[PDB]
Design a protein around this ligand. Structure first.
Ligand SMILES: Nc1ncnc2c1ncn2[C@@H]1O[C@H](COP(=O)(O)O)[C@@H](O)[C@H]1O
Ligand SMILES: Nc1ncnc2c1ncn2[C@@H]1O[C@H](COP(=O)(O)O)[C@@H](O)[C@H]1O
Ligand SMILES: Nc1ncnc2c1ncn2[C@@H]1O[C@H](COP(=O)(O)O)[C@@H](O)[C@H]1O
Ligand SMILES: Nc1ncnc2c1ncn2[C@@H]1O[C@H](COP(=O)(O)O)[C@@H](O)[C@H]1O
Ligand SMILES: O=P(O)(O)OC[C@H]1O[C@@](CO)(OP(=O)(O)O)[C@@H](O)[C@@H]1O
Ligand SMILES: O=P(O)(O)OC[C@H]1O[C@@](CO)(OP(=O)(O)O)[C@@H](O)[C@@H]1O
Ligand SMILES: O=P(O)(O)OC[C@H]1O[C@@](CO)(OP(=O)(O)O)[C@@H](O)[C@@H]1O
Ligand SMILES: O=P(O)(O)OC[C@H]1O[C@@](CO)(OP(=O)(O)O)[C@@H](O)[C@@H]1O
Ligand SMILES: [Zn+2]
Ligand SMILES: [Zn+2]
Ligand SMILES: [Zn+2]
Ligand SMILES: [Zn+2]
Lengths: 320, 320, 320, 320
């Protein structure tokens, strides 16, 4: 009773009576993630180092792989990449109805020191009948059909959230299959870890400043929270999902609108947190309700266990 | 030309005119690290999920692979594991002269959320003419013949430090060969990242507190440091070696002698840092000079780029 | 423009407007073949040999893997295995409409000396509405919906024939995907290799005896045919498919009805040869037209390039 | 306990008190065979089929991997390849004392239909005090220091024969390690399989003809032998070593000096057969005693179980 991702997606497409265009897209996504995972684990590196006698940095190659494999699903009309200034309009022969927003290799500062990196994606349905253009990507994350990420960590995991729930799949690289290892994931209501880059403590607003303080010096004299900040949003959000706690990347003054991008970092991760029973907020509003105006717009985000996120939203409220 | 770890170790053994007993040992570490890497990446997991009809949790397995493959080398007499209450004395039939101190899977809290984990090891030459015992492991780190670690991060890397210097080997998993990618590694003199678990801020001593303060609000008005703390010592020490900066786990009033263990976490990493041109101090003395009195003794450690560690030792001096 | 087997099967199921039950079955088949290929290449063998301190012969395990993965496709009601005396009736919860006939590891005498072995399968649609029983498997191969084989040779290849043609897919074991490498395969009209076990020359009928003779001593004094007989039907039929020539395993007197079994050796391979433009005959009739009476019935078979098979059928005719 | 090939070669080198130059060489063969095995199994093929948007045919690549990884050993002075018109003299900077004769990918006709293929090698110690030349390769096979082959069949196996005997190592591709699975291999005294290309029956001499006749129609009325002929010498010789029997490629009147080459096909396999207790004859003399006069010279060879080869030498004597 092994459920593979291939079996799971097809079963879901059949219960939903899709024409199979969305199933084709998700199957292409699973193929693109396995190919990236293999290049990230450095298979074939001996050839660069001349094992047979005698370039593509991993993020450019992860980008070429997601664009090609997704264009050949015949299921997308618009692609937005973290790595590309403009939205990619798929050629008419290869068009389908979906819009995919992705970060091809997340945790750019973490690539060379070999810490966990990952791929983040969100899928929208084209809501118009005109030529595909950037406009089709500019939808609130509330409109996502599916979103998720693949983590290339000690093992590779693909986490997929759709209307029905969040499920986690582990890649068995011996057979190239993702196996369902966690069905219907729900985040703990309260965690014990907070995750933020405190080197920006000087630019933090008073509510963040107050909340961190409370985590280190708890008023009630319970144990302080542990701190963890891997530096790759994928890696820090996955641990928040699996262990609980809170992850924050607020507006500071170098990034006054936050550093993380809305369509392919914040919205995918916000949708997974909400399908898992957590909250994802800007501090003032829910991330999935923002209507973007630029495909590379930034938003501050705080996401994680609902009691921890509620505790910080109450501090935001008493500072107005 | 492709220098594999097997070619490198055999040539270093030839230069040194060793009998070949330490080359057999280093070759046995290379095999155990490859077998742990494959298990960590979850190859064969489908069989656990019933793919063929019809769990040695990853740290017990890593522990069992290092002890067995190292007894089979005929090169060791005493083995000290993070996982083991007592020193393991190798049966006289497999007995050789080296003492191997190791942490088989570091970053215990990070195993389940799939963040980078790793193996740490230090090798001593047995010095007594007595029967092998715990005592042959209780040598200052200054007496280490070789030390290093394997990081199972986005790719698997082995870093080996011997008298000659520090060399980095990348595993090419397609051929099961460690390839020399970075020779005679030297840490940057000053970095821009500090790494510490700030959840313990209530229990830090005043030189640590003052130092974190200067990193966040620089008195000379230079730019603040970035913060990173993955939570696995191997991953944080490895990013410190490759990018620079400082890593700290001081005594807090929960772990008043520090948390990390001297024989198999602090001494191996101190020895690597020192052969790469950096420092490793308790804040009061050099880690490699401590005379161990217990195989599971703990020590504080501060390590990293020479200028950053020196800056903290200055602050430690204006407070005593 | 890579076509993977997953993309190809789904596209074909959509053009045919299947409910997706056949697509699910073929996706399970692709997962079962990858798992067998990995166990055949001996991944993990170091664990039998005690790498970590401390049974299922490859054909019993290949059998357990095909039965479990096919039962969990929820698409089969009857299974017939080379290795099982009785047909397997799938439990009602897991039932679907298809009947699958398979040889789990072909070339039993070739397993231990490591020569090419393979998996052979044929799929029928249940043509009745009564309880599944052996009767459902007893259909002429003319009724096959899909048939094919996976060869675990120097590389792993899956050859799949359905009404529309024969296509060959190569496993890239680095990502676990089968990639379409040969579309719409057609066998050469005449080949230059004959494949038969000549150690039975004493029991051969006069038409076989005459035909071999003509291959070694050609009347017209052209070049003799080369001989090849790997000993695994999969391996010998695949070379016949790809290079042309003829493969024969006639009735001799130890196997007076031939040695090869009809439902899971002869019919699958006969269907592939006919979709590829070749012939497969008993010598008297076409193999796919035999109506079987026992699920483990044997049939002689001669298959391959049509001019070569016609030349031997003309000799059969002048010996009556 | 797990004996890897790296552990075995290093201990044999220690027993023999070698300087370590032949251990470096055998370790370089183990690495080149792992890299050819991965290429043969087609890992990374998706990249050729455009998975990332945007061939060194397998024998050229195998050739380039053996020469490069062997020059990098600093252990060879002359290399003779099946693929190379002339002997390769290693640059004085990489020059050592051994002469390596090899066939990089044997079974050229079988590469495209994916039947077992393999690598064959023989190592001589250079004997002249002269500048290295073709001449140091022209030594009788009796002067070989080590010989063996790698078979890329259903699993990858390395068979190594040195003075001590023949040992078989299975590649565990999950960890990239060759594991000792069969120690001091001895061929059966009499087998029940004969292997020859009978398509040449018109050109065989009368002792071969008579011998095949006795195998098919036994005069003492014992059971006929089975016939097997894969078509790749490594695969057929390997099945002869493990099951027994006889392998023959006599001179036919197309190849009157035989087809297989003395330095890198016949001598390596003869040396393995002899260390396993079997025979290797041209029909007239022992293969290992022939004095080569050309690095690409051909010889007939008959090899296999002692009683079967002796039976054929008897027939060869009643005809001259
Ligand atoms: N594999 C899938 N699993 C989840 N829901 C899907 C699946 N396939 C399609 N559906 C649902 O059906 C809609 C249209 O399917 P489609 O015709 O394939 O584009 C999708 O946008 C989903 O809401
Ligand atoms: N492979 C090696 N590379 C580095 N130094 C080694 C090597 N092998 C041995 N040596 C040095 O020589 C000493 C004795 O070698 P051994 O006889 O093998 O125990 C060791 O303690 C090292 O200091
Ligand atoms: N993936 C497939 N490719 C080939 N034809 C198929 C495919 N799926 C289904 N069809 C055809 O449609 C019939 C019924 O499909 P199904 O409802 O899935 O059982 C099959 O028996 C085939 O003839
Ligand atoms: N690893 C080895 N195993 C078998 N015998 C070896 C080994 N290494 C060297 N010897 C023997 O010792 C000789 C000289 O060793 P070397 O100094 O390395 O060239 C060789 O020609 C072999 O006969
Ligand atoms: O160094 P800081 O400022 O903390 O930024 C890290 C954040 O930005 C991202 C976005 O791509 O990393 P990075 O810039 O290194 O590429 C996230 O993965 C991560 O959470
Ligand atoms: O949770 P904190 O207290 O920060 O401790 C993490 C430190 O301890 C160690 C030691 O084993 O991790 P862990 O307990 O999770 O196994 C180090 O890897 C790590 O640097
Ligand atoms: O030894 P012979 O009689 O030639 O039989 C081999 C034939 O039978 C099969 C059937 O399973 O092999 P085997 O008995 O060794 O298992 C075929 O793969 C093969 O073509
Ligand atoms: O076709 P025949 O004449 O039987 O020759 C096959 C023999 O020659 C060799 C020598 O290289 O194969 P091939 O030409 O196909 O490369 C051997 O592997 C094999 O045993
Ligand atoms: Zn990012
Ligand atoms: Zn640890
Ligand atoms: Zn069979
Ligand atoms: Zn050859």
């Amino acid at each position: 009773n092994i459920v593979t991702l291939t079996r799971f997606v097809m079963e879901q497409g059949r219960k939903a009576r899709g024409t199979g265009e969305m199933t084709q897209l998700l199957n292409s996504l699973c193929t693109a993630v396995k190919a990236i995972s293999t290049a990230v684990r450095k298979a074939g590196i001996a050839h660069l180092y001349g094992i047979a006698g005698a370039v593509k940095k991993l993020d450019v190659l992860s980008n070429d792989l997601v664009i090609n494999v997704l264009k050949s699903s015949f299921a997308t009309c618009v692609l937005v990449t973290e790595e590309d200034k403009n939205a990619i309009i798929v050629e008419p022969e290869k068009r389908g109805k979906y819009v995919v927003c992705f970060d091809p290799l997340d945790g750019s500062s973490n690539i060379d020191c070999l810490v966990s990196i990952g791929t983040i994606f969100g899928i929208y349905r084209k809501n118009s009948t005109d030529e595909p253009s950037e406009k089709d990507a500019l939808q609130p994350g509330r409109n996502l059909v599916a979103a998720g990420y693949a983590l290339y960590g000690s093992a590779t995991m693909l986490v997929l959230a759709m209307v029905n729930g969040v499920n986690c799949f582990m890649l068995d690289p011996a057979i190239g299959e993702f196996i369902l290892v966690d069905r219907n994931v729900k985040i703990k209501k309260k965690g014990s870890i907070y995750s933020i880059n405190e080197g920006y403590a000087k630019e933090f607003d008073p509510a963040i400043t107050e909340y961190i303080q409370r985590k280190k010096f708890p008023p009630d004299n319970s144990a302080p929270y542990g701190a963890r900040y891997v530096g790759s949003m994928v890696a820090d959000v996955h641990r928040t999902l699996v262990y609980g706690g809170i992850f924050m990347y607020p507006a500071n003054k170098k990034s006054p609108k936050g550093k993380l991008r809305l369509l392919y970092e914040c919205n995918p991760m916000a949708y997974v947190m909400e399908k898992a029973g957590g909250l994802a907020t800007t501090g003032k509003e829910a991330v999935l309700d923002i209507v973007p105006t630029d495909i590379h717009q930034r938003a501050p985000i705080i996401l994680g266990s609902p009691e921890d996120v509620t505790e910080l939203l109450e501090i935001y409220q008493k500072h107005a």
